[model samples]
Target: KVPVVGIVAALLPEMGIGFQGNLPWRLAKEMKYFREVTTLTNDNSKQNVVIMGRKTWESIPQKFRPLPKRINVVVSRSFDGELRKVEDGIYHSNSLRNCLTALQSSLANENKIERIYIIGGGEIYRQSMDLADHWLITKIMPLPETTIPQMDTFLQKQELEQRFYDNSDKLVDFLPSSIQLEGRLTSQEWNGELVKGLPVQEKGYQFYFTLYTKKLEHHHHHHHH
Candidate 1:
C-alpha cells in the first residue's frame, strides 16, 4: 500500500517549474531541504519512495541517479531503454499505471514503504494529480521582474487550487497546521523556518514551503450534483 502520497515541486512566481529541459534556478539550500524531507522517515524500518518522470531522472548525472537509500521509480509514457539500469538499483515503468502496479509488487513485497512522493516534470504531475494526497510546494519569493529567471514550462495552477485550495469556491480551504514539519509553509507569526532552522534564502532568491493535505471526502465541494 502507498504511504503518504505527496506531490512535491518548487514553483516560480508565474507557476513556472522548468526552463528548457532543466529546473530554472539553482538554490543549493532548497535542494538540501528537499533531500532532507525525502530521505527521513518517522519509522526507522521503512524508507521513502521518490518517483520522477523519465526526463527528470535523466537530467541528473549518472552518479546521482538512484538518489540513495530510497526506491527510485522512473515513469516514462513511452519508456524504451535498455534494461541494464535495473541492476544498478532503479526501476522503470512505461506509465503511472504501470509504475504504481510495479511499485505495488516491488515496494510492498520487497521494501517497507513509508512515504511515496511524486517529484515532477510537467506531464507526470498531470497524470498523478488525482492519486496524490499531499502537496509539498515551495513557492519562490517574487523578486523584481528583471531579476526573475527565464521559464518555458509552467504548473497547472487552476486544477491545483481547485483540488486543494478552493474547496468552498473560496480561497480559504487548507488551514494552517500549527505543527510545522521541516521547511513547511506557515505564516510569519508561526515562523516555522526560523524556529526550526535557518531562513530559506539562496542566491538572491527566497522561498517558503507549504503543506496542503486534502481535508476529507466529506469536505469536497458541494458543486457535484
Candidate 2:
C-alpha cells in the first residue's frame, strides 16, 4: 500500500518554526510526542519513513543521522546526479516527489513503509503542504520576543502577532480542506476531526499537542505545483 503522508511541526506565536537552523524553544515533552507519533505503526513487520530537507537532516546530530527504527530520506537539489553510496536506512533524493517514488519502489510490499512524515525546514514544509494527509501540530502559547533576524523580520511585535498568531488563515490555507478548521483554509477538503490533544508545559511556554487526520482519497500521485 502507498504510505499516507503527514506533516509534523511546532509553531511559535509568530508562526516561526525555527530560529538559526534549530527550534527556538526546548520542550522535552513536545519532542517526545514528535518521536512517538512519527515512529508509530500498527504492524511491527513494517516501518515508517521520515522525509526531511537537507538542512533539517544536517541539523540532526551526527550520532543520530538516521533516526532509529525508521527510514530517513533527505531531499536536496545539490545532491543531484551525485548519489553517494551510503549505508542502508539512510537515503538521499533530489526532491520530495522523487523521494516518495523511490521509497514506494525500493521497499518490498511486506516491509513497505506504513506512513511518510514530512519533518521540516521551511522550504520542505511549504512544498509538501498540499500533499499531506494529516497535520500533527503543536500550538505554543505566549509569543516569543525574539526571532532569527535572517529568517524573519518583524517591524513591530503587533505585526508579528497579527500575521502569525491572530491571523493564521493564509498559512492554514495551504493544506487540504480536511485539515482546515475555523479560519484556516489552505488546500483540498479536510473532513477530519481533531483526534487528540495533550497539554504540555515547557520552560517558559505552555503548549498542546494537536493531531488532525483526514480520509485519504485513492489518488495515484500528488500534484506538482
Candidate 3:
C-alpha cells in the first residue's frame, strides 16, 4: 500500500536549483532537513524511498550516492557507464513508471515502503507532479549583496501552471502570490507571521521549508485584471 508521495527540494528565490552541474550553495542545516524528512517513517519496521534521475543522484557527493537508510532508485536510459552498475543495495530503472511499478509490486513485498519521494533536478520533477501528494520545498533567499547565484537550471512552476490550464487532471494550480507570504520574502523582519513557515536563517541566508499539499479538487489560480 502506498502511504504518501512527496516532492522535496531546496530552491533559490529565482526558482534556481542547480549551478553548472551541482548545487549553487551548501547549506549544511538544509541538507540535514532533507535527510530527516526523507528518512523518517511512521512505522519503525518500515522505511521510506527516494527516486531521482541519474543526474540528481550523481550530483549527490560520491559517498552520499545511495543517501543511506532509504531505498535509492536512480532512473537512467543506460546505467552501464555510471554508478557502479550494480543493483545490490540500490536500484536502477529505465523509466519513472517502471520504478513505481517495481515499488508497488515486488519492492513493497520485500520492504515496507512507507513514503515515496521524488528527489529531482528538473525533468524528473516535471514528469512526476501528477503523482505527488505534497511538496516540501525549501525556498532559499540568499543575501542580496551576494550577487545573483549562478543557476543554469530552474524549477519552472510558471510553465507548470500554464500547462495546468488545460490538464486539470494533472494537479492543482499552485498557490497565488497573495497566499505565498509573498510581500515579506525580502523584508529583514518577517514579523513572525506565518506558506509561511518560520524562515530558517542560516549562514546569512533564509530558507523556508514550506509544505504545499495537493489540493486538486478545488484549488485554482486566479489572475487580477
Candidate 4:
C-alpha cells in the first residue's frame, strides 16, 4: 500500500516554530507526546518513517540522530551519499518526493514501513505542505518572550508568519479544502477518551493538540456528483 504522508509541528500564536534552530519553549510533555505519536504503530512488525530537512536533522542531538526504531530520511540537495542504505536506518535524498519514491520502491515488497511522518524545518514543511494527507499540530498560545533580542530571530519569525500564516489567509488556504478535524486533545483530558488530557501549560503558554485529515479526491468527487 502507498504510504500516507503526514505533517507534524508545534507552533506559536505567530506561527513561530523555531528560535535560533531550536524550539522556542520548553514543554517536556509536548516533546513526549511527539515521540509517542511518531513512533507508535499498530503493527509492531513494521516501522514508521520520519522525513525531515537537514536543519531539523541537525537540531536533533547526535546521540539520537536516527531516532531509534524509526526510519530517518534526511533531505538535502548538497549531501553526497547513496540515496538509500541500511546503515543506522538513515537515508538521504535531494528532495522529499525522491525520498518517498525511494522508500516505496525499496520497502514495498518487504512491507517494512507502516507510516510516513513529515517532521520539520520550515522549508521542508513548506515543500510538503500541499502533499501532506494529514496535519498533526500543537497549537501554542501566548507568545513567549525571547531571552535574547537577536535581529535574525525577529526576522525569521516575520518570514515564517508571512509564508505560513498570512499567505494562507490565516490558515484557511494552508490546509486542504476537504480537511476534517479528526481529533483534539487538551492537557486535562490527555489520558482519557476523546482526548488524552489538557495540554501541559507552562512557561506562560498553553498547548492544545489537533489532528486534521484531508479527504481523498475520490471522496470529494463523489460528494459533488
| Evaluation by lDDT, superior candidate among 3 and 4 | 3
Mind sharing the TM-score for model 3? 0.73
Tens digit of lDDT per residue, candidate 4, span 60-115?
A: 98987788778888888886643666466788877787677667775442877777
The model with the greatest TM-score is 1
Whole-model lDDT for model 4 versus the true structure?
A: 0.60
Span of ten consecutive residues with least summed lDDT in model 2: 186-195
lDDT of 3: 0.64
Overall lDDT per candidate, in order of appearance: 0.63, 0.58, 0.64, 0.60
Task: Give the candidate number with the greatest lDDT.
Answer: 3
lDDT for each residue of candidate 3 in 32-94, tens digit (9 for 90 to 100): 777876777667777778888978887878877678888888888875433323665587777
1 versus 2: better lDDT goes to: 1
Q: What ranges in model 3 sit over 4 Å off?
A: 1-4, 79-85, 106-111, 159-195, 218-225
- What are the C-alpha RMSDs, in order, of all predicted structures? 7.0, 9.5, 9.1, 8.8
Can you tell me which runs of candidate 1 are displaced by over 4 Å? 80-85, 105-107, 144-146, 166-199, 219-225
- Tens-digit lDDT track for model 2 on 1-225? 454454444444345677677776667777766676667666677677888889889889899778888888788897654233356887777778766655566544345667778877677766665565555566655436533223331112232222222222223343222232332222221123221244555666655555444434477989898
Cα TM-score per model = 0.75, 0.67, 0.73, 0.69
lDDT of 1 at 96: 72
